[PDB]
Amino acid sequence: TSIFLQEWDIPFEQLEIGELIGKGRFGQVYHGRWGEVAIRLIDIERDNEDQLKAFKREVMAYRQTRHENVVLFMGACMSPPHLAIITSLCKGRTLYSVVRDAKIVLDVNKTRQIAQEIVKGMGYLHAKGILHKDLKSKNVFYDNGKVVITDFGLFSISGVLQREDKLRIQNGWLCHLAPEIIRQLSPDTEEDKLPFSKHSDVFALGTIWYELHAREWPFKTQPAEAIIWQMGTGMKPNLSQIGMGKEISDILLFCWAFEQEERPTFTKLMDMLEKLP
Amino acid sequence: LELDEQQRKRLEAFLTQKQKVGELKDDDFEKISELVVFKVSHKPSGLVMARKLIHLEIKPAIRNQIIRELQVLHECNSPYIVGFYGAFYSDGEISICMEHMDGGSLDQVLKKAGRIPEQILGKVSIAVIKGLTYLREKHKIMHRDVKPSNILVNSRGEIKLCDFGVSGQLIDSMANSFVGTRSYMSPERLQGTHYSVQSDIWSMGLSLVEMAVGRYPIPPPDAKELELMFPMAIFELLDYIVNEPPPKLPSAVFSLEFQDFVNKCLIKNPAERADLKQLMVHAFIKRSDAEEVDFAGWLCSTIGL
Numbered sequence A: 001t002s003i004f005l006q007e008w009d010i011p012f013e014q015l016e017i018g019e020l021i022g023k024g025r026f027g028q029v030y031h032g033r034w035g036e037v038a039i040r041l042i043d044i045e046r047d048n049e050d051q052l053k054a055f056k057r058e059v060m061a062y063r064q065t066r067h068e069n070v071v072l073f074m075g076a077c078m079s080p081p082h083l084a085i086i087t088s089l090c091k092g093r094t095l096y097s098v099v100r101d102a103k104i105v106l107d108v109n110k111t112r113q114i115a116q117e118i119v120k121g122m123g124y125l126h127a128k129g130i131l132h133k134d135l136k137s138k139n140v141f142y143d144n145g146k147v148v149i150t151d152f153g154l155f156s157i158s159g160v161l162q163r164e165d166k167l168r169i170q171n172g173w174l175c176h177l178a179p180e181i182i183r184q185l186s187p188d189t190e191e192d193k194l195p196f197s198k199h200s201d202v203f204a205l206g207t208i209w210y211e212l213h214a215r216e217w218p219f220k221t222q223p224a225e226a227i228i229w230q231m232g233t234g235m236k237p238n239l240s241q242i243g244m245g246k247e248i249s250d251i252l253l254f255c256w257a258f259e260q261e262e263r264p265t266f267t268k269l270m271d272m273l274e275k276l277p
Numbered sequence B: 001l002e003l004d005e006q007q008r009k010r011l012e013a014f015l016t017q018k019q020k021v022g023e024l025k026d027d028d029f030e031k032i033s034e035l036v037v038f039k040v041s042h043k044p045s046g047l048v049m050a051r052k053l054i055h056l057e058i059k060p061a062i063r064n065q066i067i068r069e070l071q072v073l074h075e076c077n078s079p080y081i082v083g084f085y086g087a088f089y090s091d092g093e094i095s096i097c098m099e100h101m102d103g104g105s106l107d108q109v110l111k112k113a114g115r116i117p118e119q120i121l122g123k124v125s126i127a128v129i130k131g132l133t134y135l136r137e138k139h140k141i142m143h144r145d146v147k148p149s150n151i152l153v154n155s156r157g158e159i160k161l162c163d164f165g166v167s168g169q170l171i172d173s174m175a176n177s178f179v180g181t182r183s184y185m186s187p188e189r190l191q192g193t194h195y196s197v198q199s200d201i202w203s204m205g206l207s208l209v210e211m212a213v214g215r216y217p218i219p220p221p222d223a224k225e226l227e228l229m230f231p232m233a234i235f236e237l238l239d240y241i242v243n244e245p246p247p248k249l250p251s252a253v254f255s256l257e258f259q260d261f262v263n264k265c266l267i268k269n270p271a272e273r274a275d276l277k278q279l280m281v282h283a284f285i286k287r288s289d290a291e292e293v294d295f296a297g298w299l300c301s302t303i304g305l
């Protein structure tokens, strides 16, 4: 019913909490000292206490993860109503900020390479049987060639949706959701029971691949309802209008495929990305 | 097309109350009640206004651009559009201060009343058409968000449109949108194609049937639910709107002019859908315009003022 910090393989003596790093829908994310570290404080009341036990076992699952392209999960302590998830701190800025920086060139080769790193990390997580469930550019960090995935798995326990008969959509969320998921959304749909899958994670990567070249999300113009219907019936943009080649547009065509089984696994996707010019 | 004496008066009477303040800031206001939008008391000047606060965290340079876009509201003024007093920024919230409408929105009045009768809905149709015509002809702007919650009423008996999309940056600067179970978006807009005021006309038509029958009409009720009156995912509704035939009014209890009016508004092909000028000439509104209805009296007696 509780998670202590000496359960963990990282020897932990003291933990200093510093300044807030940023605003976020799921908990607060502070700077910390252990080396310096990143601490995410979340609060759960205690209701659905069988969900926290399920959460506990998924966290202990995280304990067995270690991979150069995956943020280092270092520990978690749960003293309800208060929870804390402690991961390594990522130097640099988020990929979202990088691609939206005019003063940073993103040649085709660089984008191939960034994508390949994300694919390696996600292939690792899949192999361990772990779905990210919220792959996006704000959850990937890039510091001069070092690419790390962040906040995998959190979305399940998150509760970021919570008005009366009206579901909260954040700006970038919809365009990362595969059609299977979009067709499910409803004002009382909940993250715990949404049909996430390995294929949905591949779809989200596909969105990131569009974002890498357009330097903006797909369906930027359009409102949420338009996006729900267009993505549900399978309508998807291409990159020709900025002059990108067939090779790197087939990537989207494969990753965004309407039928889940047509989407590659991450290992096959790694192959496909190796073969660009 | 638009002219009147008593209508000219209150605009200017507003434009006298206009100058009764020059600048606005948070401490000028005392919270009167909750309608997020608040009824507020202004102290520099005795006017009671509605102050809406939009929570936004963005850098000053964008905020100053936002204010220049919202300043256009000082330029648009019409007897069918809620008057605007000013917009300021303070402590993470943009304030939009406008005329307080003592009847609230048409959704909440509909909530109180059982159904709204045809004759009021005729006057509502004219006011919406002429308000939308004004923005097209004078400002080259579409509303983009016509629905019952954005049509306001008062005890003097005026009905005016609000919450339209004047600021492209404010729309984009908002982090998160709220999509629920009722949608008033036109088919063409849902498919991401080119759209015009025709989409506003669809929204008006669908809003009118909802208020006339007392229920959001997609999906249509079954036979036995229409008798009693007299679990669906968001994508199912939207695809229903795009592919199934539009809602229609029951053919017993409403005039042919009213049924034809909504039908012309809800034609799915926007090229065939009625335009503002054709609506102005439809039998239903010309008939409605020449009618003696105490709208204030209807409102006050059903709501309780």
Ligand SMILES: Nc1ncnc2c1ncn2[C@@H]1O[C@H](COP(=O)(O)OP(=O)(O)O)[C@@H](O)[C@H]1O
Pocket: A021, A022, A023, A024, A025, A026, A029, A038, A071, A087, A088, A089, A090, A091, A094, A138, A139, A150, A151
């Ligand atoms: N390991 C980390 N290193 C540095 N900053 C982080 C780390 N993890 C999260 N953050 C920051 O904390 C804030 C909260 O992020 P998150 O919870 O992922 O919300 P979002 O995905 O909406 O940004 C973000 O500004 C993010 O940049």
Ligand SMILES: Nc1ncnc2c1ncn2[C@@H]1O[C@H](COP(=O)(O)OP(=O)(O)O)[C@@H](O)[C@H]1O
Pocket: B035, B036, B037, B050, B052, B082, B098, B099, B100, B101, B102, B103, B104, B105, B108, B149, B150, B152, B162, B163
């Ligand atoms: N000028 C106004 N006078 C009276 N009530 C208002 C006014 N503006 C907004 N409201 C109230 O605000 C609520 C509508 O919320 P709003 O912020 O306008 O978004 P939406 O119209 O999409 O719901 C309604 O209950 C309505 O009564």
Ligand SMILES: [Mg+2]
Pocket: A138, A139, A150, A151
């Ligand atoms: Mg995150």
